[PDB]
Scaffold this motif. Structure first.
Motif, PDB file in Angstrom:
ATOM      1  N   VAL A 130      -3.224  -3.447  29.066  1.00  0.00           N
ATOM      2  CA  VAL A 130      -3.882  -4.663  28.612  1.00  0.00           C
ATOM      3  C   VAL A 130      -5.004  -5.095  29.554  1.00  0.00           C
ATOM      4  O   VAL A 130      -6.013  -5.628  29.092  1.00  0.00           O
ATOM      5  CB  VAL A 130      -2.861  -5.802  28.380  1.00  0.00           C
ATOM      6  N   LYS A 134      -5.511 -10.386  27.499  1.00  0.00           N
ATOM      7  CA  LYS A 134      -4.758 -10.479  26.247  1.00  0.00           C
ATOM      8  C   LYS A 134      -3.257 -10.626  26.548  1.00  0.00           C
ATOM      9  O   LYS A 134      -2.881 -11.255  27.535  1.00  0.00           O
ATOM     10  CB  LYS A 134      -5.022  -9.245  25.369  1.00  0.00           C
ATOM     11  N   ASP A 135      -2.412 -10.069  25.680  1.00  0.00           N
ATOM     12  CA  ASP A 135      -1.001  -9.831  25.985  1.00  0.00           C
ATOM     13  C   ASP A 135      -0.507  -8.750  25.030  1.00  0.00           C
ATOM     14  O   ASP A 135      -1.087  -8.539  23.961  1.00  0.00           O
ATOM     15  CB  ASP A 135      -0.160 -11.129  25.927  1.00  0.00           C
ATOM     16  N   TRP A 136       0.553  -8.041  25.442  1.00  0.00           N
ATOM     17  CA  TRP A 136       0.902  -6.785  24.778  1.00  0.00           C
ATOM     18  C   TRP A 136       1.130  -6.980  23.281  1.00  0.00           C
ATOM     19  O   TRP A 136       0.624  -6.206  22.461  1.00  0.00           O
ATOM     20  CB  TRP A 136       2.131  -6.146  25.429  1.00  0.00           C
ATOM     21  N   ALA A 138      -0.234  -8.613  21.299  1.00  0.00           N
ATOM     22  CA  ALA A 138      -1.520  -8.944  20.694  1.00  0.00           C
ATOM     23  C   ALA A 138      -2.517  -7.803  20.792  1.00  0.00           C
ATOM     24  O   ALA A 138      -3.321  -7.616  19.871  1.00  0.00           O
ATOM     25  CB  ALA A 138      -2.118 -10.202  21.342  1.00  0.00           C
ATOM     26  N   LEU A 139      -2.498  -7.043  21.892  1.00  0.00           N
ATOM     27  CA  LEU A 139      -3.293  -5.823  21.945  1.00  0.00           C
ATOM     28  C   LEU A 139      -2.951  -4.928  20.763  1.00  0.00           C
ATOM     29  O   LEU A 139      -3.847  -4.416  20.078  1.00  0.00           O
ATOM     30  CB  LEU A 139      -3.058  -5.092  23.272  1.00  0.00           C
ATOM     31  N   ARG A 142      -4.654  -6.322  17.706  1.00  0.00           N
ATOM     32  CA  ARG A 142      -6.064  -5.933  17.683  1.00  0.00           C
ATOM     33  C   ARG A 142      -6.220  -4.434  17.451  1.00  0.00           C
ATOM     34  O   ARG A 142      -7.212  -3.984  16.863  1.00  0.00           O
ATOM     35  CB  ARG A 142      -6.760  -6.343  18.981  1.00  0.00           C
TER      36      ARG A 142
END
Length: 261
Positions: A130, A134-136, A138-139, A142
């Protein structure tokens, strides 16, 4: 009333009605038991059965693990022969200075979550994944839609080789999980036949002992070595001579014979 029995097929031995005291000289094709030279197999007990063998096991996990491994390795060590919407001479300078350009950061992320499904699975790699963009939880979002295909992330040399090691370090526990699991899956004895067992723990087959022990192989080599071990040992030639010291029949119909010479 001590018979002496040559048997080359299972049904010959079933016929001969072995009693303790007899001398068997026994040979044919069999399988090595499970539960040591050929760990996980124990070739001092031979399963002798006519029901034909289980197939080699598969694993979706292993396939997922060695696929992520390769995805990162083919982006960390691109080969001269490579597509790239990146300049050619610019690529040659990235490699002269030790850096790393992720073509498809999005593929790295998806194939990581694909494998480390659980939230607790491989957390250190997900962290390192990451910062580099961000945060995992959410990566992955995306990356899910497909947006880090247009991001280019360039890696300074120790983060590259550190991410290298982090990927190798995370996928390895999976591939030995599944190898142990697959060996237990083959521990599924067919009813009937024999379990021929050496009293002294000597091996009944005549195969060259593997040098490297299986659990001591490298990570991305453990699955395949097991397969060769299992494919030869579930159909190996074998022989056994000796004096029957014990003889009984299973709840599963199988006759256990302990042999001493």
């Amino acid at each position: 009333s001590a018979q002496t029995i040559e048997a080359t097929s299972v049904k010959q031995l079933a016929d001969a009605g072995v009693r303790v005291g007899d001398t068997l000289r026994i040979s044919g094709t069999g399988m090595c038991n499970i539960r040591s030279p050929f760990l996980p197999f124990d070739c001092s007990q031979i399963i002798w059965n006519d029901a034909r063998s289980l197939p080699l096991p598969e694993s979706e996990l292993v396939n997922k693990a060695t696929a992520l491994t390769e995805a990162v390795n083919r982006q960390l060590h691109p080969k001269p022969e490579d597509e790239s919407r990146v300049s050619a001479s610019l690529r040659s300078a990235i490699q002269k200075s030790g850096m790393v350009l992720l073509d498809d950061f999005g593929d790295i992320v998806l194939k990581t979550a694909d494998l480390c499904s659980a939230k607790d699975d491989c957390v250190r790699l997900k962290n390192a994944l990451v910062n580099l963009g961000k945060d995992w939880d959410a990566l992955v979002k995306r990356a899910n839609a497909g947006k880090l295909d247009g991001v280019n992330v360039l890696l300074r040399p120790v983060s590259a080789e550190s991410l290298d090691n982090l990927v190798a370090t995370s996928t390895a526990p999976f591939i030995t999980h599944e190898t142990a699991r697959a060996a237990q899956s083959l521990n599924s004895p067919a009813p009937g036949g024999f379990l021929i067992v050496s009293d002294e723990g000597s091996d009944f087959v005549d195969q060259p002992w593997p040098s490297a022990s299986l659990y001591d192989y490298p990570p991305q080599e453990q699955w395949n070595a097991f397969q060769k071990l299992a494919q030869m040992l579930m159909h190996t030639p074998f022989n056994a001579e000796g004096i029957v010291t014990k003889i009984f029949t299973d709840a599963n119909g199988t006759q256990h014979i302990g042999l001493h010479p």
